[PDB]
Amino acid sequence: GMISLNNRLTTVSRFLKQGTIADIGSDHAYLPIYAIQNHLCECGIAGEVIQGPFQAAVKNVAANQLVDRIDVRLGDGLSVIQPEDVIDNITICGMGGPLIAKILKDGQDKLSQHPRLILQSNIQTENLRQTLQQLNYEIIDEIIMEEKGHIYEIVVAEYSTELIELSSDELKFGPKLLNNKNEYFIKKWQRELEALYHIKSKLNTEQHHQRLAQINDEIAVIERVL
Numbered sequence: 001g002m003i004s005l006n007n008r009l010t011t012v013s014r015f016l017k018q019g020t021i022a023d024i025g026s027d028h029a030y031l032p033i034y035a036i037q038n039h040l041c042e043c044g045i046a047g048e049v050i051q052g053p054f055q056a057a058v059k060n061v062a063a064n065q066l067v068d069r070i071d072v073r074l075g076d077g078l079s080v081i082q083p084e085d086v087i088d089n090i091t092i093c094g095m096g097g098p099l100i101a102k103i104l105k106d107g108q109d110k111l112s113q114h115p116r117l118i119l120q121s122n123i124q125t126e127n128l129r130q131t132l133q134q135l136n137y138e139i140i141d142e143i144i145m146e147e148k149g150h151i152y153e154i155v156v157a158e159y160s161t162e163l164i165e166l167s168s169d170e171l172k173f174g175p176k177l178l179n180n181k182n183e184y185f186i187k188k189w190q191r192e193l194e195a196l197y198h199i200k201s202k203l204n205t206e207q208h209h210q211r212l213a214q215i216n217d218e219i220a221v222i223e224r225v226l
């Protein structure tokens with residue numbers, strides 16, 4: 001149709017199943033609008049937690065003539081999900097891993113119909129993989145990509161009738177991304193190493209035993225996997 005998405009969200013859109021998209025913390029509803037204009041989905045829910053983004057989403061849905069196709073809802077995380085909703089995809093993008101984790105954990109009662117989850121994490125994706133484990137979700141695909149110099153991970157997960165246990169390396173680096181180790185995987189984790197060694201330039205070893213132990217273990221893990 002008419003909206004242009006960035007590569008990050010375009011990449012998320014390629015994982016959408018037909019039917020309904022619920023986009024939590026929606027980008028002025030541009031992902032739901034894009035999905036309906038490109039016939040990826042036929043119905044949308046756009047969840048917003050504050051009034052500014054809420055009103056911007058309402059205006060954007062009206063401007064694209066999709067008032068009867070996209071429901072814009074105010075509420076925190078999955079609280080926007082209503083018991084009558086039939087949802088094929090939940091998308092949670094442009095957030096840190098720990099916040100996506102919290103939204104899924106705190107809203108876990110909302111996942112009873114076992115939608116596909118497409119999560120796009122800006123940092124600390126480990127926490128989201130740990131939560132997906134706890135909710136009987138299984139990672140079926142992962143992408144790591146770069147846009148304007150920032151490295152982003154997309155995690156695609158579906159329900160499993162048995163809990164899938166991931167190793168400490170699989171939770172930290174991704175069970176699919178480990179199989180690749182593309183230029184963006186290397187760049188992300190070289191940059192994390194640089195940042196961890198830089199923190200060591202600022203912490204006296206006499207005074208920060210606890211944090212340095214954690215930092216040194218993380219460096220050792222990354223140096224083994226690269």
Ligand SMILES: Nc1ncnc2c1ncn2[C@@H]1O[C@H](CSCC[C@H](N)C(=O)O)[C@@H](O)[C@H]1O
Nearest residue numbers: 024025026027048049053075076077093094
């Ligand atoms: N607890 C929460 N529940 C729902 N939305 C939340 C939230 N905390 C933050 N948000 C919203 O999530 C958005 C994060 S910015 C990213 C926007 C879009 N998903 C994208 O990927 O480009 C903002 O709209 C912010 O208000």
